[model samples]
Target: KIRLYQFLLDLLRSGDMKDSIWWVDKDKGTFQFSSKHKEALAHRWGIQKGNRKKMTYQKMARALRNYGKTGEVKKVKKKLTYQFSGEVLGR
Candidate 1:
């Protein structure tokens, strides 16, 4: 669902994390996820979901694509980023 997708993106936008992620366009809510900490982020998702084996960035990215259909997220041309609209956040 979009729940996990939202959580990961929220973390990306949060100031707590260093530079493993970034907003390619902050005002537009567009962002990119670096491959540098790919495993680390996946591991965090593992713990959060209680299933390390099943959790993965690929899966999460795929879920994010679903939201693109509704215009909540934009379809990514590259694998590393996705744009989120503020309209969805307001909801």
Candidate 2:
């Protein structure tokens, strides 16, 4: 199973998602959604989740925020970056 954070980080590091998504701040783990490609991002995320209806940007963000609750993620004020600070497990 692919961890949400890993997938997001991959998208950030790779230019493949550049037109639709990109990290707003790498060190802080913040990302941005291109309003012009909102549907495209959602569709891509849906594919990742195996259900298009199962993946929405809001849901994705919520998962990232919950990671912060576990000390594995962090949130920045006035920004959309969900920072990851945990080691990849079972990889």
Candidate 3:
């Protein structure tokens, strides 16, 4: 099934992007949404989630922060870059 982080990283792996809308390093399981496309990514995430009709960076950021508690992700000390925890590298 398509989970949030899965969908996110898949966007990096998939060639759907014309030229990567975000700065991502799947090897490190870390990414930062670009200021230029933050809103677009947020809305895109909502559509992918199939529940959020109107998503914003505020909401998106909050959800990402919550992932920190789940341990699969971490709120990085450097800006908005969220880092994946554990063995997500091989994923």
User: Which candidate number has the best TM-score?
Assistant: 3
Instruction: Give per-residue lDDT, candidate 3, residue 63.
Output: 76
List, in order, the clash count of every candidate structure.
0, 1, 0
Query: What would the TM-score be for candidate 3 when compared with the true structure?
Result: 0.77
- Mark the regions of model 2 whose C-alpha exceeds 4 Å error after superposition: 35-39, 52-54, 86-91
Q: What tens digits encode model 3's per-residue C-alpha lDDT throughout 1-91?
A: 5767776667766746523344467567777767666777778778777763697878877877787777677877776678776566466
- Return the clash pairs for model 2, or none: 30-81
What is candidate 2's lDDT per residue for 1-91, written digit by digit as tens?
6777677667767788788777776655566667676557666777977973656677766766787667665776644444556453222
Q: Estimated TM-score per prediction?
A: 0.74, 0.69, 0.77
**Which of the two, 1 or 3, has more TM-score?**
3
Off by over 4 Å in 3: 18-25
Arranged by lDDT, best first: 1, 3, 2
lDDT of all predictions, in order shown?
Answer: 0.69, 0.66, 0.69
- RMSD of each candidate relative to the true structure: 2.6, 3.2, 2.4
Q: Rank the candidates by TM-score, best first.
A: 3, 1, 2
